[PDB]
Amino acid sequence: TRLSLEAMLAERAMVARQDLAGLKRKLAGADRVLAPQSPEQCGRESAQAQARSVTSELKSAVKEAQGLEHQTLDFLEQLGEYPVCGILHGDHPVHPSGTHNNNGKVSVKRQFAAGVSDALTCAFRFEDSDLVRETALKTTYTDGTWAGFVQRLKMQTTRKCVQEKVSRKLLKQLFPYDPQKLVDVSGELSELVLGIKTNAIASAGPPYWRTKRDALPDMLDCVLPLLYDHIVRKDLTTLRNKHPELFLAECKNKTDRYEVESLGEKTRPYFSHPFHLSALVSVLSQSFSGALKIMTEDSTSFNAYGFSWTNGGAEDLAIWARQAGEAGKKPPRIACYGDDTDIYYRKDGKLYRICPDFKQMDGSVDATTIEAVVDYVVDAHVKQYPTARQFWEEVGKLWVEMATQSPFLIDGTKVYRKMQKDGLMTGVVGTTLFDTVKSALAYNDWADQLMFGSLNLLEEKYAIEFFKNKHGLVIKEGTWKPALVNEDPGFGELWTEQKFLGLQLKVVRRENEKVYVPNLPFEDWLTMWVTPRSKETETMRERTLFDRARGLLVTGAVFDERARGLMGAVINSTAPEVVCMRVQEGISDGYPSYDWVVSLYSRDHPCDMPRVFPEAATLIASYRKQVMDTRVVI
Amino acid sequence: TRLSLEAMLAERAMVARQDLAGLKRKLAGADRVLAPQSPEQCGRESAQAQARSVTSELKSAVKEAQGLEHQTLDFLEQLGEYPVCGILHGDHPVHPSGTHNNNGKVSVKRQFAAGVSDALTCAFRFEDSDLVRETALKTTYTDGTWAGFVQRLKMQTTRKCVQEKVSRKLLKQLFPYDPQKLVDVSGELSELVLGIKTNAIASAGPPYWRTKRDALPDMLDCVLPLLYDHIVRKDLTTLRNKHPELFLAECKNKTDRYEVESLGEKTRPYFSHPFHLSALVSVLSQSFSGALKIMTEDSTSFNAYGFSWTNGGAEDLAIWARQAGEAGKKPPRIACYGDDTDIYYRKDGKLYRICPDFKQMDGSVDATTIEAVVDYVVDAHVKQYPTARQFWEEVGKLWVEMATQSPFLIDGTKVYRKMQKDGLMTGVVGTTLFDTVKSALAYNDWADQLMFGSLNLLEEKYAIEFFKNKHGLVIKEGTWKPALVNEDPGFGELWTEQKFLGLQLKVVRRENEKVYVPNLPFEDWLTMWVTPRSTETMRERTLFDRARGLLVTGAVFDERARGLMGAVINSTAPEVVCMRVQEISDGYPSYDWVVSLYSRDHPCDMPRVFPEAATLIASYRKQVMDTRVV
RNA sequence: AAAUUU
RNA sequence: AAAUUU
RNA sequence: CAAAAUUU
RNA sequence: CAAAAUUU
């Protein structure tokens, strides 16, 4: 058919980036802007052998920890077995035949695989063998162990909690929001649920037993209308009795970076709820998160949920922290993201910083906090939108139940329930906000105690005791270590050596200006490199190494000498065709230069990454524009 | 990745339209809005067999005509052999190695292949065998014959022409344009050339010897800047001598619907020019075609290039035609599209209509007309954009050369040239405009002669002689038969039985309103159906698309043709109707929708074959759920 | 598709 | 991608 | 990957 | 399928 020459050129370029052999031929003589790198310490085969050795030792340790016996699940209420859902949508049951079914009973099987790399081979190629070996034997990305899973589940379900003193007024002070940014919940429900964002490959939960992508029509067309009709009729107890799997959850073992020494003691449990329930509550949660302010925007906010290190965020944290005041006389600067807190106070005019963490904070989350957070979010919406008060208040009751008393399967047909309402069931929508509020309520009380003159609470022993006795929260060991802050750090200097949100804060130099950037020691970047959170062709594996190397540089590895070198070596080792191939993005052929990453963390206007091959576009299109004037004199 | 549920539903729908087995399952109980159709006259096996039989006979006749010896090509100038282009673009020669090369010399091979069906099988399945057989044996889509190709080439190249008397003023009256709709040619050349439209699978010609899609970078990056530099240095003669293939064309046989009786005498020739030269001139031609007005827009216009039968166009022709005046005293209504012309005169106050066609009109196109059209177009641009006058005047000279004296290859290495400047080399950019203008100049002069009282020219013998002697144009036999017009036709009545642009005009009834629509007898529609101008899934989709297209062209206004096309659409499996296609096209042309298209109604989508298809493919139908309930 | 974080 | 036209 | 925040 | 016009 007839097409413009521009359109033909565009189509050709798209097709050309999908032809690897063509890309190889076109870029075979192209100039490459190579990243700064560190040299090879050993050959390909030596690196592969050292990797194979460490991988064999790790697989032995993981297999041994997975063989460890687990304690009984008698700490949980036993609710029996549930029949498989018989709801039919069109030609198929919502619960697929032959799946999650033992004699008409819903069943699950916990997977604890022995695991098993390209990244480890690259580390041995460019780094000291002893350091790489010690780093890779210390931490591994694994499904964990039955023993660690049950142990952590016991702690999360059996912790004695302290009911917080919380009002909507306190929550407005600690967690301010913009009411105009809240979505209109008085709108039609179908449109609202369609607006929620989700992980397409995540499990839709019972009764779908498939990805949210595959189960979306069964949710929207069949189950969600059923649920709505029972909500508006106050007949949800009938729905639960007739269809229990509609309100069933799955306790799952989290695949995570786990310390090899503690694999038998710690495997984190999470709960996978039904899609219909999650989607309804996500209308309220995703709207509220959009309206939520952060501490840098409001001095009263204890909220770091939403904070970005980029676009001046790192410097914003320092500006916010310096406005901290003398303990007992003026307010401290406290910001919380779940279990992670940044605390700033002044003693004799000198700024000090504490970066404490809590242990299994979800078990400590009391039911009063959960109900109050739900009331705060629901009330925020019904104030701005009063026409839909009753429906969303009923959704709030479903939210509290999913967060505290949802029945759940672990392995097999037995359904269990937490004996106590206290304890957040991690995985419910709002998990991070519930944890953030609990932390902020405790730290707000701690600051009130300092204004009352209890300055001994700045000290570790008293602080640990305060959070346990008054708030049921256990301070992680080593996390209460007050440190003098370098308030105006010179070039190449750290604010403190402590980490907030997993990263240290450092000042770097651009001309004579100071740019605040995230930083970590080399060992920390090396741990992340060797332990990919990977869920296949050689090409995709080569692209994955390039993408991971670029990601770690943008996260701050560009500010560590050895990490910048390793990631540069991986990027430079990537074939030209793999760098310039068509890829799924948010063609990504740029690289993170030191200057680009400095610009990202600065308040500079956004810019594209410098190109690895500056002539790639012209070479792939086989055409470079030459200006040809029609106004010449002939 | 993190995505909205709305976006996930949109992704799912697109993917499902590409899963034909899933489409089959989800549409297995769907209600189908079946098109009106005529019944099966015979079974699949019998229809396939009768098709095979007619096909065997037709192949034999085509092979016999293809075997006929051809006459000599000595009527043309012989320019020797041209060396293969040695220009290199990076790692590859612009002229590919191993292609179009005989001992270093540019070569081509004409293809005259025999043979060419699903459509004929459908016709035998739903129509009388005798009519279908007669129809299929009369016309075939073929590459033609060597004998017919050379005969037509001789006619096109050796015809005595008459130089028209033309001015920019006559051309402004007969072909008015909107100057502001002209593209700014004062702009940078690369941008202007990237703005042009082209057939991606058409030949880029010498020296690329590949599709325009494959040759586009070699043209833009290597040849176009070489050509530009020589244009501004007046050194094009040097470029031609060093690189002659840059200015070489290929004379090719046109694959077309041809009468089997005349295959040995008639195979149409066309010229395939270099992409670089074509693209440069296409800047001017495509811009001018955008600005051109039609007879319905300007009463002075004799131009039907740009006319649409749709959106009231058919009725616009009737309104325009009735404005005709008495022969001898007031202006007739004349519109021309290449060789095709619609003429309306009033004799004794009664509207009359002539629809004549010229024969091998391109040979009759004189050099003065070609030069004048080029000058008219170049001048239009340089008047609105004067800073670029010199460049486009040089491009104008290349345009006239391509239209008249381009060296060309036919078969093998011999390069040829038309001995006379006269004669249009069909295939040059502007071919249809050159033909339209020549026709219009001749008919403007015929009208001037009528106003002089030579009203005898309304008669066949007189008109034929006038066009041959005064304009070098040969009126096709039968095309001069004036006819009384039904100025306001009744429901189901033709304006005339004559064909303009291949179609009759007819009034149909919608409510009590009249809708003017195109029309043809069933035998014409069946000829088009059995002679298509061309995986089982692709073949089934093609039948559905061809049936829909013919209904939209007017087959819906013929009882038997509507029935046959409806039978083909109804026979198409649901998955093939609803599958993702290059333009989701799951609609069908109802009689009412086609009446709407030809009316001045606001555009609407075709009625769906499966109205619940979208909801079934998505497996979801929206149910309103109010959050403001108690 | 990828990085970090809880 | 498909229809008609020159 | 259960919910998520930030980023490319 | 050489240039094209109209249409889906």
mmCIF file with all atom_site columns, N, CA, C and O in Angstrom, chain A residues 529-552:
data_model
loop_
_atom_site.group_PDB
_atom_site.id
_atom_site.type_symbol
_atom_site.label_atom_id
_atom_site.label_alt_id
_atom_site.label_comp_id
_atom_site.label_asym_id
_atom_site.label_entity_id
_atom_site.label_seq_id
_atom_site.pdbx_PDB_ins_code
_atom_site.Cartn_x
_atom_site.Cartn_y
_atom_site.Cartn_z
_atom_site.occupancy
_atom_site.B_iso_or_equiv
_atom_site.pdbx_formal_charge
_atom_site.auth_seq_id
_atom_site.auth_comp_id
_atom_site.auth_asym_id
_atom_site.auth_atom_id
_atom_site.pdbx_PDB_model_num
ATOM 1  N N  . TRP A 1 529 ? 25.413 -7.968  42.945 1.00 0.00 ? 529 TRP A N  1
ATOM 2  C CA . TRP A 1 529 ? 25.806 -8.495  41.614 1.00 0.00 ? 529 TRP A CA 1
ATOM 3  C C  . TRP A 1 529 ? 25.764 -10.023 41.590 1.00 0.00 ? 529 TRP A C  1
ATOM 4  O O  . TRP A 1 529 ? 25.083 -10.547 40.721 1.00 0.00 ? 529 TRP A O  1
ATOM 5  N N  . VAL A 1 530 ? 26.419 -10.685 42.532 1.00 0.00 ? 530 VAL A N  1
ATOM 6  C CA . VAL A 1 530 ? 26.522 -12.172 42.490 1.00 0.00 ? 530 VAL A CA 1
ATOM 7  C C  . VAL A 1 530 ? 25.179 -12.835 42.839 1.00 0.00 ? 530 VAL A C  1
ATOM 8  O O  . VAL A 1 530 ? 25.062 -14.012 42.536 1.00 0.00 ? 530 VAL A O  1
ATOM 9  N N  . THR A 1 531 ? 24.224 -12.119 43.424 1.00 0.00 ? 531 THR A N  1
ATOM 10 C CA . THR A 1 531 ? 22.947 -12.746 43.853 1.00 0.00 ? 531 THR A CA 1
ATOM 11 C C  . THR A 1 531 ? 21.762 -12.199 43.042 1.00 0.00 ? 531 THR A C  1
ATOM 12 O O  . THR A 1 531 ? 20.907 -11.550 43.641 1.00 0.00 ? 531 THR A O  1
ATOM 13 N N  . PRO A 1 532 ? 21.639 -12.430 41.705 1.00 0.00 ? 532 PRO A N  1
ATOM 14 C CA . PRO A 1 532 ? 20.537 -11.845 40.958 1.00 0.00 ? 532 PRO A CA 1
ATOM 15 C C  . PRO A 1 532 ? 19.166 -12.372 41.395 1.00 0.00 ? 532 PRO A C  1
ATOM 16 O O  . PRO A 1 532 ? 19.047 -13.536 41.688 1.00 0.00 ? 532 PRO A O  1
ATOM 17 N N  . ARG A 1 533 ? 18.197 -11.470 41.480 1.00 0.00 ? 533 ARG A N  1
ATOM 18 C CA . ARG A 1 533 ? 16.814 -11.870 41.830 1.00 0.00 ? 533 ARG A CA 1
ATOM 19 C C  . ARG A 1 533 ? 16.171 -12.311 40.522 1.00 0.00 ? 533 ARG A C  1
ATOM 20 O O  . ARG A 1 533 ? 15.264 -11.621 40.051 1.00 0.00 ? 533 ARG A O  1
ATOM 21 N N  . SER A 1 534 ? 16.658 -13.419 39.967 1.00 0.00 ? 534 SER A N  1
ATOM 22 C CA . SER A 1 534 ? 16.222 -13.888 38.628 1.00 0.00 ? 534 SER A CA 1
ATOM 23 C C  . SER A 1 534 ? 15.047 -14.861 38.704 1.00 0.00 ? 534 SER A C  1
ATOM 24 O O  . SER A 1 534 ? 15.206 -15.920 39.336 1.00 0.00 ? 534 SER A O  1
ATOM 25 N N  . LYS A 1 535 ? 13.943 -14.532 38.031 1.00 0.00 ? 535 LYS A N  1
ATOM 26 C CA . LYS A 1 535 ? 12.757 -15.428 37.989 1.00 0.00 ? 535 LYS A CA 1
ATOM 27 C C  . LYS A 1 535 ? 12.813 -16.314 36.744 1.00 0.00 ? 535 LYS A C  1
ATOM 28 O O  . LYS A 1 535 ? 13.283 -15.821 35.707 1.00 0.00 ? 535 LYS A O  1
ATOM 29 N N  . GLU A 1 536 ? 16.442 -20.665 28.468 1.00 0.00 ? 536 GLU A N  1
ATOM 30 C CA . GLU A 1 536 ? 16.564 -19.245 28.040 1.00 0.00 ? 536 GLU A CA 1
ATOM 31 C C  . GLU A 1 536 ? 17.790 -19.077 27.140 1.00 0.00 ? 536 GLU A C  1
ATOM 32 O O  . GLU A 1 536 ? 18.829 -19.692 27.436 1.00 0.00 ? 536 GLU A O  1
ATOM 33 N N  . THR A 1 537 ? 17.689 -18.232 26.117 1.00 0.00 ? 537 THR A N  1
ATOM 34 C CA . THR A 1 537 ? 18.781 -18.084 25.124 1.00 0.00 ? 537 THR A CA 1
ATOM 35 C C  . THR A 1 537 ? 20.001 -17.348 25.666 1.00 0.00 ? 537 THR A C  1
ATOM 36 O O  . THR A 1 537 ? 19.863 -16.582 26.625 1.00 0.00 ? 537 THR A O  1
ATOM 37 N N  . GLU A 1 538 ? 21.135 -17.571 25.019 1.00 0.00 ? 538 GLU A N  1
ATOM 38 C CA . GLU A 1 538 ? 22.387 -16.883 25.381 1.00 0.00 ? 538 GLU A CA 1
ATOM 39 C C  . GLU A 1 538 ? 22.204 -15.376 25.214 1.00 0.00 ? 538 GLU A C  1
ATOM 40 O O  . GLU A 1 538 ? 22.727 -14.647 26.040 1.00 0.00 ? 538 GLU A O  1
ATOM 41 N N  . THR A 1 539 ? 21.473 -14.954 24.188 1.00 0.00 ? 539 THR A N  1
ATOM 42 C CA . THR A 1 539 ? 21.255 -13.515 23.910 1.00 0.00 ? 539 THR A CA 1
ATOM 43 C C  . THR A 1 539 ? 20.564 -12.845 25.095 1.00 0.00 ? 539 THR A C  1
ATOM 44 O O  . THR A 1 539 ? 21.045 -11.806 25.525 1.00 0.00 ? 539 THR A O  1
ATOM 45 N N  . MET A 1 540 ? 19.479 -13.427 25.582 1.00 0.00 ? 540 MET A N  1
ATOM 46 C CA . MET A 1 540 ? 18.733 -12.844 26.722 1.00 0.00 ? 540 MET A CA 1
ATOM 47 C C  . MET A 1 540 ? 19.625 -12.826 27.961 1.00 0.00 ? 540 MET A C  1
ATOM 48 O O  . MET A 1 540 ? 19.566 -11.853 28.694 1.00 0.00 ? 540 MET A O  1
ATOM 49 N N  . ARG A 1 541 ? 20.447 -13.850 28.144 1.00 0.00 ? 541 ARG A N  1
ATOM 50 C CA . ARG A 1 541 ? 21.369 -13.889 29.303 1.00 0.00 ? 541 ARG A CA 1
ATOM 51 C C  . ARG A 1 541 ? 22.403 -12.760 29.189 1.00 0.00 ? 541 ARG A C  1
ATOM 52 O O  . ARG A 1 541 ? 22.678 -12.124 30.203 1.00 0.00 ? 541 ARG A O  1
ATOM 53 N N  . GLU A 1 542 ? 22.927 -12.520 27.992 1.00 0.00 ? 542 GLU A N  1
ATOM 54 C CA . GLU A 1 542 ? 23.909 -11.437 27.768 1.00 0.00 ? 542 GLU A CA 1
ATOM 55 C C  . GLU A 1 542 ? 23.253 -10.077 28.003 1.00 0.00 ? 542 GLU A C  1
ATOM 56 O O  . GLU A 1 542 ? 23.886 -9.245  28.640 1.00 0.00 ? 542 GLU A O  1
ATOM 57 N N  . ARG A 1 543 ? 22.031 -9.889  27.520 1.00 0.00 ? 543 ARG A N  1
ATOM 58 C CA . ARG A 1 543 ? 21.292 -8.625  27.758 1.00 0.00 ? 543 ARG A CA 1
ATOM 59 C C  . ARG A 1 543 ? 21.053 -8.444  29.258 1.00 0.00 ? 543 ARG A C  1
ATOM 60 O O  . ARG A 1 543 ? 21.165 -7.321  29.721 1.00 0.00 ? 543 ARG A O  1
ATOM 61 N N  . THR A 1 544 ? 20.724 -9.520  29.961 1.00 0.00 ? 544 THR A N  1
ATOM 62 C CA . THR A 1 544 ? 20.403 -9.427  31.406 1.00 0.00 ? 544 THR A CA 1
ATOM 63 C C  . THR A 1 544 ? 21.632 -8.902  32.157 1.00 0.00 ? 544 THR A C  1
ATOM 64 O O  . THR A 1 544 ? 21.457 -7.999  32.945 1.00 0.00 ? 544 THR A O  1
ATOM 65 N N  . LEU A 1 545 ? 22.819 -9.409  31.844 1.00 0.00 ? 545 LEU A N  1
ATOM 66 C CA . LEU A 1 545 ? 24.072 -8.923  32.477 1.00 0.00 ? 545 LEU A CA 1
ATOM 67 C C  . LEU A 1 545 ? 24.261 -7.425  32.205 1.00 0.00 ? 545 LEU A C  1
ATOM 68 O O  . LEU A 1 545 ? 24.589 -6.715  33.140 1.00 0.00 ? 545 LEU A O  1
ATOM 69 N N  . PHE A 1 546 ? 24.045 -6.981  30.969 1.00 0.00 ? 546 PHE A N  1
ATOM 70 C CA . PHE A 1 546 ? 24.181 -5.551  30.601 1.00 0.00 ? 546 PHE A CA 1
ATOM 71 C C  . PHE A 1 546 ? 23.178 -4.724  31.404 1.00 0.00 ? 546 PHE A C  1
ATOM 72 O O  . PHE A 1 546 ? 23.582 -3.733  31.975 1.00 0.00 ? 546 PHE A O  1
ATOM 73 N N  . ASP A 1 547 ? 21.929 -5.160  31.448 1.00 0.00 ? 547 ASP A N  1
ATOM 74 C CA . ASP A 1 547 ? 20.862 -4.405  32.139 1.00 0.00 ? 547 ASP A CA 1
ATOM 75 C C  . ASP A 1 547 ? 21.137 -4.338  33.643 1.00 0.00 ? 547 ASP A C  1
ATOM 76 O O  . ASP A 1 547 ? 20.924 -3.280  34.214 1.00 0.00 ? 547 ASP A O  1
ATOM 77 N N  . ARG A 1 548 ? 21.574 -5.444  34.233 1.00 0.00 ? 548 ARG A N  1
ATOM 78 C CA . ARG A 1 548 ? 21.863 -5.499  35.685 1.00 0.00 ? 548 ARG A CA 1
ATOM 79 C C  . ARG A 1 548 ? 23.042 -4.579  36.007 1.00 0.00 ? 548 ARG A C  1
ATOM 80 O O  . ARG A 1 548 ? 22.965 -3.872  37.005 1.00 0.00 ? 548 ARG A O  1
ATOM 81 N N  . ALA A 1 549 ? 24.081 -4.609  35.178 1.00 0.00 ? 549 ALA A N  1
ATOM 82 C CA . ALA A 1 549 ? 25.266 -3.757  35.388 1.00 0.00 ? 549 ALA A CA 1
ATOM 83 C C  . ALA A 1 549 ? 24.865 -2.283  35.318 1.00 0.00 ? 549 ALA A C  1
ATOM 84 O O  . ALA A 1 549 ? 25.282 -1.530  36.185 1.00 0.00 ? 549 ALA A O  1
ATOM 85 N N  . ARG A 1 550 ? 24.054 -1.936  34.333 1.00 0.00 ? 550 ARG A N  1
ATOM 86 C CA . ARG A 1 550 ? 23.573 -0.543  34.186 1.00 0.00 ? 550 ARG A CA 1
ATOM 87 C C  . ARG A 1 550 ? 22.745 -0.150  35.406 1.00 0.00 ? 550 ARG A C  1
ATOM 88 O O  . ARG A 1 550 ? 22.968 0.937   35.919 1.00 0.00 ? 550 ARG A O  1
ATOM 89 N N  . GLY A 1 551 ? 21.844 -1.024  35.840 1.00 0.00 ? 551 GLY A N  1
ATOM 90 C CA . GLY A 1 551 ? 20.976 -0.750  36.996 1.00 0.00 ? 551 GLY A CA 1
ATOM 91 C C  . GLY A 1 551 ? 21.751 -0.451  38.255 1.00 0.00 ? 551 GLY A C  1
ATOM 92 O O  . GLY A 1 551 ? 21.432 0.534   38.895 1.00 0.00 ? 551 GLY A O  1
ATOM 93 N N  . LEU A 1 552 ? 22.760 -1.267  38.552 1.00 0.00 ? 552 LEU A N  1
ATOM 94 C CA . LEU A 1 552 ? 23.549 -1.097  39.790 1.00 0.00 ? 552 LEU A CA 1
ATOM 95 C C  . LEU A 1 552 ? 24.327 0.220   39.726 1.00 0.00 ? 552 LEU A C  1
ATOM 96 O O  . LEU A 1 552 ? 24.365 0.889   40.746 1.00 0.00 ? 552 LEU A O  1
#
